[PDB]
Amino acid sequence: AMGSMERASLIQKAKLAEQAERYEDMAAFMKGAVEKGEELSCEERNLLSVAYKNVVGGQRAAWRVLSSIEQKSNEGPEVREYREKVETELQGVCDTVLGLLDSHLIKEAGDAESRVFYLKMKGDYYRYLAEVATGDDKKRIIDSARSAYQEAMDISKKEMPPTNPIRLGLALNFSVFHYEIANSPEEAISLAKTTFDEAMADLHTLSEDSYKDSTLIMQLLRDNLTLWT
């Protein structure tokens, strides 16, 4: 689709699409940029992630509305058919993102910051697949999310300080995985509390701007702990 457009033009248009709140366009521009085959910078990785999180976030919100109506109706075929249509679309977007990570973003990512970022994405998009999966295939999808998050966690704990925002966001999302997907609320609570406490003890090392970045995500961990305890 985007093979004839320059990489730099795809990046520029992804930024314009974000300003215009055109997230499907944004995601298509960033897919085109990934498919140029070069590694992504920190800013470009963020554009890729923001684009797809907005696309799949709208699909997930729609799927939840439709799934609620469908469950109530089971307390014609149209509600199920339309929930299935939205579900298939959502699965297709998740498969597209997972395909970009597998061909070839992860394998070329050698610095800890890029590798953790992509493995967190891989965990997130398997988690969104798990949200709509039913049965034993749900089990293998759940394991794929778990494995991606665990590898990211292992690298992050070895290579990044406890206040690093990607390390923090990874721990936040892995704790949500434990609570919401893996039926492990105590593991969720433990991980959120340990992550929060270890970040708090490292705040003294940070500049004012880094302090703001880290404390914002720490508050999200606290917000989940408040809801869970």
Partner: peptide, 9 residues
């Protein structure tokens, strides 16, 4: 339970 919103660059 909230994950990272992640929707604004």
């Amino acid at each position: 339970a909230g994950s990272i919103p992640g929707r604004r660059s």
